[PDB]
Design a protein around this ligand. Structure first.
Ligand SMILES: *Cc1c(COP(=O)(O)O)c[n+](C)c(C)c1O
Ligand SMILES: *Cc1c(COP(=O)(O)O)c[n+](C)c(C)c1O
Lengths: 396, 396
């Protein structure tokens, strides 16, 4: 049965850790997968989650199966983070949320639901986007069409070309938007651009699918949700695939959420019973540990207060490294004004390096970056910054 | 988009906890989902896992993303449990295992892999089987055909009818076998029947898919794997979907495994890179907590020694309740010799009650059982045994 199965190619992001950990060189720098690092080059487990895990240890009684949709406390806390404390969607009982294994898991549950219970065929994703977006929707049977987004010349969002691209998108199609910290470009719409985009989705009848993996990493928790909230007010139906991997540093515990909203309570509950059936035919119900850590923190005033200070420390540290990368590329002799990456937000810098420059950087200098030129700024420290900028100027 | 989505029906097993927890009656007994209960009617978190969780608390440094296939220690310990300490499959590097979200998650990863990378169309599952078997394979696009298994008259495995059913199964088809504690009947093949079955699979060219959710619940850890090991010796290729929910009492942490075996090392590694790609397009990589608890225990002599004593205590307690159910149905006046359930193993008793008797039991007496007549013996205690048998004799 397996004699003719040819090998899958390596994953552009996850396949980099395989290679990096097989590299023997005593100075190699990682920069590939989007994981935060502190000043010492360690990815620590946050204090707020270590204390929540203590609590869980001494206060859990059972490991008995959670419902298909997970912990309800989790689900209420998520909706309030996404839509606002005292939103109309929460009060009209218009939103239903299931707990999933991370944002990828939330994106697949969404694709399965839509493939089985809706008339969609096309999903529209930005050029460029996270690589694994194509892969998840195609697994469900859905085709993936592309919309323009970045202007590589001016290092801006080409908004007139995005508008124009999306005029080939029909009523009934899904348009995937990133809520904040666009992966890979780092360029987000302004509130004004998000409002234009919202009225145009209503007018043309597109179903918004928001990918929201970086809440808290651009300006702050509530600010980062302005785009989504501008849409939620205009729209009867939308789905958001949220993740807590990043902003809670809970990467390997797999905690995320798939929130479904419809016109009213009766409809969203009908729709959600099908999303529950799609979940049962995949994994059966969700992993409890990471998700009850999120819920313990969000519920406790003290533990929440320690967490959004740990999250603003992470965002501020990346902010300093983005400046330090631009300053040190200048004193190392790069002839290219790299000042545009300071305007990008999130964990990454989309440097504009070519696939060959990226490839020469791992093979000669041992610094690992994604083949699109995406580099992880949150992986940069003051100690690896000069060997790093020295490697990039030599390849330019 | 969602106006015409009609409601999915409730899950026969998981939908029972929704109903039970909405029942107001002060004497209702659960008996539906396969979760162990101790003498006090509590599902406790085991001591061996509570100590492993302590360890994890004080010794983890990061929550950084695990590889697509999970913890390798976990993967080596699983293969040794399944195939034996010093098996040829382990030494010829013929087996590859990925960590999944429970046995359901392992079964879906298997269905996706097979749908995308193989020529299969049909999967053969026993009559009767776990309900959710149909649902998982159909999600991947595969059809599910049925093979005879139980003789409801004599309360035995109708082996000549199973053999005969499976003669309509073609070369290249998948036949799903339960490794031990058949869900729902409780009737397993003898070693001799498993050997006959193994030589016949080789002869007819079927791909074995073993479902192995109950290791340790029939006779013991190694004994329960005799059927699988009889097949593994005869076969070049097979896949086993294992779970640790039951035997570790880690139900809601979602820990299981999908093991792929092929003729040689080169082939199984080629095949496994496609199974890794199917996993990345679903959730991205697996939840760490439950799986590193399994791995901490299996690795430590003391913690492993406390665990297989906690597991033999669970199996022995169910054994006593199976006798106590048969004895108390007799002194409560049931005219039906219910002695056949003593020969069934695992957590359940397939009582032979009709769908109407089952339905009358929740609506008048508040005892909850699956609509096939499957009752959970491990949910029975000496304190709920008489109200329970009183309810069943009144419905007969
Ligand atoms: C980091 C990241 C992820 C990873 O999600 P998990 O929660 O599954 O780890 C997912 N998406 C969709 C994006 C855009 C992203 O940057
Ligand atoms: C209890 C049980 C399960 C549940 O598996 P999880 O590990 O996903 O909880 C799965 N199967 C396949 C069977 C047969 C079973 O009894």
């Amino acid at each position: 049965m397996f004699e003719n199965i040819t090998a899958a190619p390596a994953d552009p992001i996850l396949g980099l850790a395989d290679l990096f950990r097989a590299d023997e060189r005593p100075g190699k720098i990682n920069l590939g997968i989007g994981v935060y690092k502190d000043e010492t080059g360690k990815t620590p487990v946050l204090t707020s989650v270590k204390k929540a895990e203590q609590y869980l240890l001494e206060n859990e009684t059972t490991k008995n199966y959670l419902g298909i949709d997970g912990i309800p406390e989790f689900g209420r806390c998520t909706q309030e983070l996404l839509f606002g404390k005292g939103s109309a969607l929460i009060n009209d009982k218009r939103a239903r949320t299931a707990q999933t294994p991370g944002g990828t898991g939330a994106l697949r549950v969404a694709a399965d639901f839509l493939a089985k219970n809706t008339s969609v065929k096309r999903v529209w994703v930005s050029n460029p986007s996270w690589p694994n977006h194509k892969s998840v929707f195609n697994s469900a049977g859905l085709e993936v069409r592309e919309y323009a987004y970045y202007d590589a010349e001016n290092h801006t969002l080409d908004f007139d070309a995005l508008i124009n691209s999306l005029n080939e998108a029909q009523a009934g199609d899904v348009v995937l938007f990133h809520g904040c910290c666009h992966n890979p470009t780092g360029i987000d719409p302004t509130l004004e651009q998000w409002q234009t985009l919202a009225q145009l989705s209503v007018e043309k009848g597109w179903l918004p699918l928001f990918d929201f993996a970086y809440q808290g990493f651009a300006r702050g928790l509530e600010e980062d949700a302005e785009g989504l909230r501008a849409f939620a007010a205009m729209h009867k139906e939308l789905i958001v695939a949220s993740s807590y991997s990043k902003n809670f540093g809970l990467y390997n515990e797999r905690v995320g959420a798939c929130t479904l909203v419809a016109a009213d309570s009766e409809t969203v509950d009908r729709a959600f019973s099908q999303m529950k059936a799609a979940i049962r035919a995949n994994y059966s119900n969700p992993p409890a540990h990471g998700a009850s850590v999120v819920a313990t923190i969000l519920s406790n005033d003290a533990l929440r207060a320690i967490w959004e200070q740990e999250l603003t420390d992470m965002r501020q540290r990346i902010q300093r490294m983005r400046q330090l990368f631009v300053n040190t590329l200048q004193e190392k002799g790069a002839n290219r004004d790299f000042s545009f990456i300071i305007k990008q937000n999130g964990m990454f810098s989309f440097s504009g390096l070519t696939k060959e420059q990226v490839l020469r950087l791992r093979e000669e200098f041992g610094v690992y970056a994604v083949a699109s030129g995406r580099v992880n700024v949150a992986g940069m420290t003051p100690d690896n910054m000069a060997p790093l900028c020295e490697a990039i100027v030599a390849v330019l």
